[PDB]
Amino acid sequence: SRYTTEFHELEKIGSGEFGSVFKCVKRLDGCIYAIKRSKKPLAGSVDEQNALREVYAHAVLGQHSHVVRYFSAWAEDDHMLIQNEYCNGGSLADAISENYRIMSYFKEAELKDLLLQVGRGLRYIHSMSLVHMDIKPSNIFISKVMFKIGDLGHVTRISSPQVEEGDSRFLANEVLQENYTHLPKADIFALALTVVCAAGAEPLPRNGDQWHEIRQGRLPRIPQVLSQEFTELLKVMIHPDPERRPSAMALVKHSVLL
Numbered sequence: 001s002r003y004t005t006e007f008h009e010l011e012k013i014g015s016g017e018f019g020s021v022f023k024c025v026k027r028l029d030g031c032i033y034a035i036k037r038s039k040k041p042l043a044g045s046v047d048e049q050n051a052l053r054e055v056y057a058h059a060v061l062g063q064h065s066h067v068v069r070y071f072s073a074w075a076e077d078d079h080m081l082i083q084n085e086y087c088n089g090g091s092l093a094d095a096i097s098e099n100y101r102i103m104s105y106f107k108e109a110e111l112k113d114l115l116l117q118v119g120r121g122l123r124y125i126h127s128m129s130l131v132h133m134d135i136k137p138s139n140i141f142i143s144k145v146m147f148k149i150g151d152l153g154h155v156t157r158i159s160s161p162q163v164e165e166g167d168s169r170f171l172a173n174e175v176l177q178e179n180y181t182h183l184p185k186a187d188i189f190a191l192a193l194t195v196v197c198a199a200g201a202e203p204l205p206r207n208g209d210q211w212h213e214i215r216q217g218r219l220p221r222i223p224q225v226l227s228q229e230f231t232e233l234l235k236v237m238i239h240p241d242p243e244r245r246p247s248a249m250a251l252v253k254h255s256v257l258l
């Protein structure tokens with residue numbers, strides 16, 4: 001196999017229904033990569049289409065410091081592989097879990113920095129006429145800390161008529177309603193909530209009354225004091241009217257983030 005011959009597998013770093021992810025040394029170049037090895041979907045299937053969109057997204061989203069770099073993808077056995085930049089700080093989700101246990105969260109300057117860096121990655125994705133569709137802390141990677149958007153498994157063109165919905169803790173209501181007129185603003189909504197998690201919030205709801213309440217534009221409770229200016233930004237990014245949310249470009253240019 002290419003995998004076995006070109007790479008020394010060092011550590012399993014992620015597991016799922018879908019893949020495993022391994023941290024690997026490439027024998028020839030001496031660098032470490034994250035490699036995801038998933039089961040090759042059935043040719044011609046809607047699932048292969050999805051799989052290959054991740055690959056096509058990666059191969060047009062290799063120029064940005066806030067999007068995980070792609071190196072290669074290939075097929076072999078009944079396996080599909082993708083070889084990506086290794087981020088050695090793990091996911092934002094794990095940094096959040098650790099913080100939760102020690103009751104020490106991202107402080108406002110760190111939250112702004114998180115917001116801005118991921119904001120830059122979305123502005124880039126969005127300028128390629130693409131939308132990420134699954135922004136959440138387990139899809140943000142940490143490498144000065146750098147945050148990088150990864151897991152382009154839900155990526156779609158901005159005017160697609162059909163969309164695979166991302167995680168429901170982060171899902172904007174308009175997408176759940178199958179209204180795709182303003183898909184970029186779904187990423188904006190998911191990002192605010194990602195920043196709310198980083199700020200120390202309880203785990204977000206998947207359904208039920210608390211789910212619906214956030215979708216009315218109410219920020220979950222954050223266990224620390226933030227500037228009014230910053231809270232207002234987060235709250236407008238979850239506005240029930242998607243047009244009210246800032247675009248990624250307005251976000252990066254925002255005076256709160258200057």
Ligand SMILES: Cn1c2cc(C(=O)NCCN3CCCC3)c(O)cc2c2c3c(c(-c4ccccc4Cl)cc21)C(=O)NC3=O
Nearest residue numbers: 013014021034035036068084085086087088089090150151
């Ligand atoms: C599950 N997982 C990771 C896990 C870790 C991680 O847990 N590393 C173990 C060491 N801990 C110790 C405290 C720091 C992190 C990591 O550093 C990076 C990745 C990681 C990366 C990636 C992915 C990934 C997600 C979707 C599709 C394909 C990939 Cl390769 C999935 C990944 C990626 O693209 N780039 C990455 O660095």
Ligand SMILES: [Cl-]
Nearest residue numbers: 093136137138
């Ligand atoms: Cl998450």
